Design a protein around this ligand. Sequence first.
Ligand SMILES: NC(=O)CN(CC(=O)O)CC(=O)O
Ligand SMILES: NC(=O)CN(CC(=O)O)CC(=O)O
Ligand SMILES: NC(=O)CN(CC(=O)O)CC(=O)O
Ligand SMILES: NC(=O)CN(CC(=O)O)CC(=O)O
Ligand SMILES: [Mg+2]
Ligand SMILES: [Mg+2]
Ligand SMILES: [Mg+2]
Ligand SMILES: [Mg+2]
Lengths: 370, 370, 370, 370
Amino acid sequence: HMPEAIEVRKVPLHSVSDASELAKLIDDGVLEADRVIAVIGKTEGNGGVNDYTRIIADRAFREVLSAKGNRSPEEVAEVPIVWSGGTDGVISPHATIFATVPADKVTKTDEPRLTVGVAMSEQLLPEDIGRTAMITKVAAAVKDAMADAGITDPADVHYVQTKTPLLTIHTIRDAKSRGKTVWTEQTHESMDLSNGGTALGIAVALGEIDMPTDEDVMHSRELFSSVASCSSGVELDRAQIVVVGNARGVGGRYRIGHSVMKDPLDQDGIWAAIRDAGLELPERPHSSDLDGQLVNVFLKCEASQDGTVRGRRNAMLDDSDVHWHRQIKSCVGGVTAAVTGDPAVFVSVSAAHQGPEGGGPVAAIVDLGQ
Amino acid sequence: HMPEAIEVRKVPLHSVSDASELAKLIDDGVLEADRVIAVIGKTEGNGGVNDYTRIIADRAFREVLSAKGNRSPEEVAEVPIVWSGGTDGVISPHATIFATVPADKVTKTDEPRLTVGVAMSEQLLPEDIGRTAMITKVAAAVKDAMADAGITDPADVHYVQTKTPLLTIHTIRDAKSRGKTVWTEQTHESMDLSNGGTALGIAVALGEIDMPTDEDVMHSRELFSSVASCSSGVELDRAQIVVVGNARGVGGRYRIGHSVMKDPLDQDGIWAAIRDAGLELPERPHSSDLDGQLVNVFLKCEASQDGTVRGRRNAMLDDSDVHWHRQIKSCVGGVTAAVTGDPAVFVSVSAAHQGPEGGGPVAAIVDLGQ
Amino acid sequence: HMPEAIEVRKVPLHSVSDASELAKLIDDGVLEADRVIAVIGKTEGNGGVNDYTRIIADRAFREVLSAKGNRSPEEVAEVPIVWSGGTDGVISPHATIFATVPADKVTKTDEPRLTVGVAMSEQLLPEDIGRTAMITKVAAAVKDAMADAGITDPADVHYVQTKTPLLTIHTIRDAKSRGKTVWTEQTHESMDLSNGGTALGIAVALGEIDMPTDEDVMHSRELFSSVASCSSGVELDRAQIVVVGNARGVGGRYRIGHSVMKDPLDQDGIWAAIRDAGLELPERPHSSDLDGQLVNVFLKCEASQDGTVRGRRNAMLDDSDVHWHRQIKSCVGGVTAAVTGDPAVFVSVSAAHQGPEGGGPVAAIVDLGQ
Amino acid sequence: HMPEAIEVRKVPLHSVSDASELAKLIDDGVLEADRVIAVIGKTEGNGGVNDYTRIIADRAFREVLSAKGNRSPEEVAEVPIVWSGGTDGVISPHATIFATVPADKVTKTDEPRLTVGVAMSEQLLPEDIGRTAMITKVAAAVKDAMADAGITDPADVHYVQTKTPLLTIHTIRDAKSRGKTVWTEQTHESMDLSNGGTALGIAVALGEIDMPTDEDVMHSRELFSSVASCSSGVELDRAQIVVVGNARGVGGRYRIGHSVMKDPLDQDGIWAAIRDAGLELPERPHSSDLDGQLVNVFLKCEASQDGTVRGRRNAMLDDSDVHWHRQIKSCVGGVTAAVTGDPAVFVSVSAAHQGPEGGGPVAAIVDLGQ
Ligand SMILES: NC(=O)CN(CC(=O)O)CC(=O)O
Ligand SMILES: NC(=O)CN(CC(=O)O)CC(=O)O
Ligand SMILES: NC(=O)CN(CC(=O)O)CC(=O)O
Ligand SMILES: NC(=O)CN(CC(=O)O)CC(=O)O
Ligand SMILES: [Mg+2]
Ligand SMILES: [Mg+2]
Ligand SMILES: [Mg+2]
Ligand SMILES: [Mg+2]
């Protein structure tokens, strides 16, 4: 329960089943396998429903964690690992690894430094998905995780990465066998609904919004969290919550900060996250100012329902050829990598209630040590 | 033959068949229909072979030019109009209109101001496409156009927008009936080949490279033009050349400049084009510095054959789901619109021999008047 | 109001903007432009939202009808013309033209022969779409059209081709300005909802089902019409109904029949439609038995929500790369063209409440004359 | 070297990583793991370059073969397993398993019964791919495999399933380091080239054609094998050949036959393969005649370069949205499954020199036992 200092490393994936850079970090003593508490990565699949790159990476990474540690494959299975597929354009497949640091390697400081808390919610039934029961169950797990990270002020929470169930053929039918209804009968739509409801639960937990109603979900886009990054996948019947923020008195060399991207072109929002994280930059920063101190950024993007960016129409929402999810991801990947100078960026789509409409939250993790 | 001063206006398309903003410019006396000499735009189709948005726009625009002028529909048919389809991500459909200015509306100056020259090459036979016969025929038409713009120094050419034939079922077979071979038998590939060969012809005309050989085409990517922007489409059996540069002693309020984007994230390359065009900007510019003085940028993009950007792997070239053409366009659309602050940007793909590999030329047109 | 004898001709489109075969039929005296009462065709676009091939064909065909007749372009605009885009696989672009026959060219018979009735429903408001108000307004227009065709027994209705509104940004917002809700906020989904609600209205009008409830729409797939073929498109704020059946005492040389395809592979269902239309065939027919007597077939297809065909799983519903609409269309295009021997077949997708789940209605028009 | 009797079983895949039906066949004593000599299956990925479903299935199947047998994972790695991805439309993921039968389970007969031979070619260098060196190396390995199956008359070869290298970034560059050229620089194209050259090598080995020249490859489509089914994938630097035919004096209960599909709608070609395999059927067969005696069919399909089927134009080759590979696969999947009544059919694309243009070979394996 007490927070520990964190080591965080961003590593490339050299192929779909590659975990060799994790293995290397362990071999070289940078981190200990059994101390890996979360992994959050980008994989090269389509970013849709039938994206099998997520399970390939998952197997490769868990295999390393089981092989190089004393944890059993069962214990290793409980480690939250979130793979956001789809690396359209320049986005480079990668994983960000979070591990606790042994006491004999930390210098405690009163400065804010990175902390991580993890929680699983109560079981999320198909008829919960996208409705206020999901919102309340999420909210309670987010408070659990926040406590687990040592954080009492929501202002010190900067990034809440989640994973929640989808609605499948199997679960839609289970609901129906019990005389329950589901919000939608399509798998694809349910990913966006699942993320959106979860986001609302985050927003409620952190005091960003009042408890909303069922009719708000997917509709009242003015209600949102400024720190939620939600993902979904068949593997669970609960929400997995990873809270990332800062705490004082922990030590460590990393710090997290955040802002929002107001729209897909809002580079200044990204720079604002980096400054918030504690890097001192010029008034007009450039990627060349970073000198290896930016570990990663994590952000959400979306096409707004109004079909416009900076007053100009685009055709993303009507495009039956290439889903707007993939279009906007590629676009924002560029806008983001142009700030960071590094195409290994965590850029995710499906952003309902995650940041303002047409935008998204952005978190930055920086290295403030020697 | 003598150059005239140019008025250039960028207008949105509000729908696929909309030319109302052109009609408005004519009604309001900004330009005269019969003085429109070129149009270069972005349309909302797929950007591929079966993109019928190009012909829809074409009809809409030519209808206005015929209705509001004294030119016959035949004369109006000779006006070069280039539609680059595919507006992935935020890119906004639009057209940039170039028109000559009556003598009683120009103040002649020795400063460099925008000039346009136009030429059609000799007939380009199917077995010419992608080979040195195309290169030589292009080169001669580019010299013709350069002369037509009043430009003697290639250093004053900043943007050469072209349109060249594709290879179709019909033409591949014509070649064969005469006992000729073609470079490739696939329509899709032939668009990229056609643009690449044309680019080489531009590079030869301007002294950027020595005359290459057949085996160089599509292969020697170190050979390229820094001003070529080439497009292709079934409508022609000749190359249409639009040379855009500057000349002194013409007058007008617009000026063009250029640079190259070294890779997809090279915002500084875009800013370099804008400075070259004559806008004085801060050392680290931001879009908010532009205050309506940037008319448009025109640039090419591509995924490099090495599969990497700033040393990080991406999976664009292996992606059988969404062609890398569309991925990179969306990405670079974002990177570009982030510089200009305006999603109406001319961003095109198919860049062989147009700028360095993985990059492309970028031209900027700025308004230096009151 | 009284029914007339019908001439029906299926013509290819040689390109996206080609109506030359219609022009030819008129020039050769096969039919009169002013007597064309409906056109139903397949166009080569993507079959999705951003399919601009439908408007191209529409313009080309209406231009012929206005040029070669005495009807004004306004009157010609009232002719129902339905374009179902997406010709995946072998499906060949084409149009089926229905025209009335002058009295001096008909031999009246008591045999059932083809008749067509047309109606427009009351205005369909955005909050009607997919709900019982749509169902009732449709139902009344279907009764209107049935009467217009001279049909009193629903058993003589074999094919009801419709066109209904979609929900757009504009209409979703109009609803909201009046304090109304809409069934869904996504354009793509609303096409399927619009067709499904319309189908239910057809089923109610013909006595195939009892009046359903709002919650049935898109959900109770056991409720369906065996003759409905519904399509949607922004051009209208009403439903356009084309009823095609038979009546006795009219004359003419064509007759229509129908059945259902129980699943995507149900060739026997197609053969059953052809027999029902009045062609005498062997017990096990083959395409070579048809000898030019099959004008066309018109049918719907879909992937079932259970993810299976003849007890075998497929992955259509999870496929984020190529929408199942396009997969199933291509599949059923083959299965269908294999029966008819002619790839010009009207195969459409979006089949909720149109035929049993995983299947669809199929109608056949045959030539029983000399 | 001497041929053995063969047991062949077609099993579904219930998910991407499922080999449970293979495991079940082994547990139930139907076949022995160590006697599995080839597996040929369909997987649910995109059927393109970035199809990771093939490696998932591969791992799942080899894991079973290693776990349930005495072969080492190294020996199990030598078993030819060919996964053809892309199950567009109704096609159901599945694997066909071939195993030898112990002598105490066979009744020797002079009737033709199924035999399998396997060979690996000499190393295939990048500059071999698509050229006559590939053709000769293939041809020799096909003769090797034919001998390994006990077949001296090519007329007894009915299906030759292969796997050959692609050209990658890595291999294209290796070629270049040795001062060699490659046929094409694009991975996607090289899959089709690789299959086409291999097919030609099969055709040469079996006496179907004379040795062709480099310029014939991909161009002279009148040259083809009537039994070749070629696939490609990064895993090899040699061709893997699986010859399937019949031999007399072996015994077993299965027999193979073949024909060709002349075009995508040629159901009679499929029925001809089934008859050739030895099933007695009515003059006009129907799927209901099969009564469980059809194990599987294996066939190739393609869009012809002339853009037509049974004299009607389609738009497959110009479609930049959904590649014609996927369109034609879905179409032919339907046409095929309609014959077999079973959506688990091996339908593959990339058919240059495999069957006539616009068509493909089709082989059928039937169970003639009790
Ligand atoms: N809900 C999700 O996981 C959305 N994912 C889906 C996927 O990862 O395949 C896309 C993304 O994260 O950008
Ligand atoms: N060769 C071309 O015209 C390439 N075009 C093709 C098209 O416009 O549809 C894509 C682009 O210009 O970005
Ligand atoms: N609702 C529709 O019109 C469905 N359409 C959409 C389209 O035609 O673009 C697809 C089809 O008819 O097969
Ligand atoms: N060359 C190949 O393996 C072609 N494959 C590619 C793949 O399996 O992903 C498609 C098919 O076999 O139908
Ligand atoms: Mg948002
Ligand atoms: Mg380039
Ligand atoms: Mg149905
Ligand atoms: Mg073939």
